[PDB]
Design an enzyme around this catalytic site. Structure first.
Site: not given
Ligand SMILES: O=C1CCCC2=C1[C@H](c1[nH]ncc1Cl)N=C(Nc1nc3ccccc3o1)N2
Ligand SMILES: OC[C@H]1O[C@H](O)[C@H](O)[C@@H](O)[C@H]1O
Ligand SMILES: O=C1CCCC2=C1[C@H](c1[nH]ncc1Cl)N=C(Nc1nc3ccccc3o1)N2
Ligand SMILES: OC[C@H]1O[C@H](O)[C@H](O)[C@@H](O)[C@H]1O
Ligand code: NA
Ligand code: NA
Lengths: 391, 391
Positions: A235, A45, A137, A42-43, A140, A185, A36
């Site tokens: 955050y 929700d 951002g 922003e900030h 994921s 999200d 998305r």
């Molecule tokens: O450690 C953090 C803190 C910030 C948010 C965050 C993570 C973290 C991540 N980022 N890089 C390596 C890794 Cl493990 N995984 C995801 N999303 C994420 N989406 C995914 C989809 C498929 C497989 C792994 C995924 O991880 N998101």
């Molecule tokens: O709008 C900022 C945004 O930030 C992050 O992505 C959070 O996951 C959401 O819920 C939202 O608060």
């Protein structure tokens, strides 16, 4: 040149191959859930505000099969993901709940299983693929949570509403990733429609579909390819700061406050609390106005509201960074661009730009040339939400 | 008291069984599309007005398989589908198209094939099963059209939005059923969500999903089990009157005419014309007021608007009938009933009643006792729209 977004049939083919190789048979089930971009809001929700996101064609794909042994066996090809790429754990039971651990990426899947409201849930083997850039951002983690929730529904149908599913994925993010996110999200990953952004009221959970299906308008996403460490740590600080201003003004949330009461209450709160709350109260009003504007096809007024969203995030909320500010100014200098701002949490990730379809090639040449770092670009149409892929 | 509403699992098993017997093998593909009840906003959709429908747990299910021979082969199990209940025809070409013919039920399927926007469409074998009462005024026909569309998407993916899909289904009803309907029934069958009503702006095609999350409140549907011959003949006559009084006021549609403006232009139009437009223009205002009452949780205000709507349809628009009126007056007499009104086209079919859940049993006894004919009842909650079902 913008980054080729792998279509769904392509991620699915990679997911079957890695699965067929890993578990020695074809997966029985499959699902997709998108990332998305937030256009504005922003900030807001976690403040019962309004947001205006759209789902992307950047997505997470799960394939798998039920098991009989009560275990979960995961593999991810995601090459950002922390080691190991594979993880197994038992299903939670009456005797013992799951806990967050290592690797981090599996915490999102564990959390959704733990709070999945329907029973009996069988064990399963699954592979996870994603085109959503990790930590960039574009949500994921929400794509993974919602892909997991959608998969679990194929094993064991649930009986509640689409908001309830978003709230389960939100609860997983809170308890298993330690990240106290609002509902945006998860909600957009679930409720997105092709050709539409979603006006989400995070107080009522009413949603409005707003067309973008105009061929001479383009939404450009610029990844800074930076994530400062402030990102994770600051955050939950902004969220508790907002909750403290609402509590000090005797309001259930900042949704219920407007700038006039806030001006008048400014000695009940820190200088800093005042500035955070002023961002939120304004951004709620901007998102309502942006939505009416978009519905009207008034892109210039939408563009103004986006730039005022950016300034407010940069100066009152302080969740921008030199890299995002530089990307925004660069985009605004280009003719055909209605507006630009940071999207998601901040401290890195992406800007979103609304511009003339015809202006998009020049826009990427200029921004890249006018960026200190190495930008990545996505040309994004509003996509559908989560769905089942019938294998 | 209330008629049992088969679940999707049970409709699938009935459809698979019929398909195995008819075509000699398991079907490959399955879809479902629901019927609907309109809470308020009647005969406004073709006046570019506002409507507030919800999807029902009554639905149509297609199971089928692609063919190699460019033939369509249909069977329906539906209770009062006209003979024959099985038929086979070749796909249309540019050279030659399909035409409406015998039987009437297959016209809904032929129309959606003819106007299906993507190519190449293969032949197919399908079985049609439905729990929507044929001609009961809960849009059995829209549910068949949307199920057919959703099924053709599995043979041959489309690339427009959800709104265009509703318009293809609307065009099939116009050309193949001779019924110059608005967009409501097709839109709600596509876009419904569990626990939500759908506010449709039929001018912009903007939609809002409005939550129904008070378990103390219920919606009782009373089938009069009556269909007067006016229902065929008289719908296009009302539509034509609305068009004439709009031209005669120099307006694009009755959506463009405020009630106070209409009331002072009595001399521009026929007395009949004037009463038709007073219903329409007033019903558009009542629909906006009803949405705001839902959002506020004012079910008493919502109920009163339902009754005004009934009176308007009955006296100004003249599309009620003695059976519907008896059923409405019978319902309003029951403690716990906030409001009751005819729903859909009129000249027969169903009333919708908003009441305390706890009162529903007393309502069904009082209404049946005080009804000249034989009432059927459904206690339906807001259902999901059209879905794929993985076999
Ligand atoms: O450690 C953090 C803190 C910030 C948010 C965050 C993570 C973290 C991540 N980022 N890089 C390596 C890794 Cl493990 N995984 C995801 N999303 C994420 N989406 C995914 C989809 C498929 C497989 C792994 C995924 O991880 N998101
Ligand atoms: O709008 C900022 C945004 O930030 C992050 O992505 C959070 O996951 C959401 O819920 C939202 O608060
Ligand atoms: O003849 C009219 C005029 C009014 C509208 C109308 C019909 C007509 C019908 N009514 N009774 C017997 C039949 Cl045949 N079929 C449908 N819907 C309909 N939905 C259906 C779903 C599955 C199978 C057949 C269906 O028919 N709807
Ligand atoms: O609101 C009355 C209703 O009548 C019929 O059921 C049509 O299908 C709809 O388009 C609408 O006009
Ligand atoms: Na650069
Ligand atoms: Na009776």
């Amino acid at each position: 040149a913008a980054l080729r977004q792998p279509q769904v049939a392509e991620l699915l083919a990679e997911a079957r191959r890695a699965f067929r190789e890993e578990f020695g048979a074809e997966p029985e089930l499959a699902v997709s859930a998108p990332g998305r971009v937030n256009l504005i809001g922003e900030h807001t929700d976690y403040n019962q505000g309004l947001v205006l996101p759209m789902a992307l064609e950047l997505m997470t794909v799960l394939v798998g099969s039920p098991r009989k042994d009560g275990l979960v066996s995961l593999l991810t090809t995601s090459e950002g993901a922390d080691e190991p790429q594979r993880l197994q754990f038992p299903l939670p039971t009456a005797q013992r709940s799951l806990e967050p651990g290592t690797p981090r990426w599996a915490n999102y899947v564990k959390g959704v299983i733990q709070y999945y409201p329907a029973a009996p849930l069988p064990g399963f083997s699954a592979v996870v693929v994603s085109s959503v850039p990790l930590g960039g951002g574009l949500s994921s983690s929400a794509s993974l949570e919602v892909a997991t929730y959608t998969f679990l529904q194929q094993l064991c149908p649930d009986s509640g509403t689409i908001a309830a599913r978003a709230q389960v994925c939100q609860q997983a993010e809170h308890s298993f990733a330690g990240m106290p996110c609002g509902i945006m999200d998860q909600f957009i990953s679930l409720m997105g429609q092709k050709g539409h952004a979603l006006l989400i009221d995070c107080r009522s959970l009413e949603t409005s579909l707003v067309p973008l299906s105009d061929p001479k308008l383009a939404v450009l996403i610029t990844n800074s390819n930076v994530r400062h460490s402030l990102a994770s740590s600051e955050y939950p600080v902004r969220r508790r700061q907002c909750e403290e201003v609402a509590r000090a003004l005797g309001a259930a949330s900042l949704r219920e406050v407007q700038l006039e009461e806030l001006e008048a209450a400014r000695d009940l709160v820190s200088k800093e609390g005042f500035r955070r709350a002023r961002h939120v109260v304004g951004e709620i009003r901007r998102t309502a106005q942006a939505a009416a504007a978009l519905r009207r096809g008034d892109y210039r007024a939408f563009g103004r509201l986006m730039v005022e969203s950016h300034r407010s995030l940069r100066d009152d909320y302080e969740v921008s960074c030199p890299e995002l500010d530089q990307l925004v100014e660069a985009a605004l200098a280009v003719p055909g661009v209605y507006g630009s701002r940071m999207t998601g949490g901040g401290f890195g990730g992406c800007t979103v730009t609304l511009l003339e379809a015809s202006a998009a090639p020049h826009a990427m040449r200029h921004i890249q040339e006018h960026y200190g770092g190495t930008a990545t670009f996505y040309l994004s149409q509003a996509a559908d939400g989560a769905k089942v892929l019938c294998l």
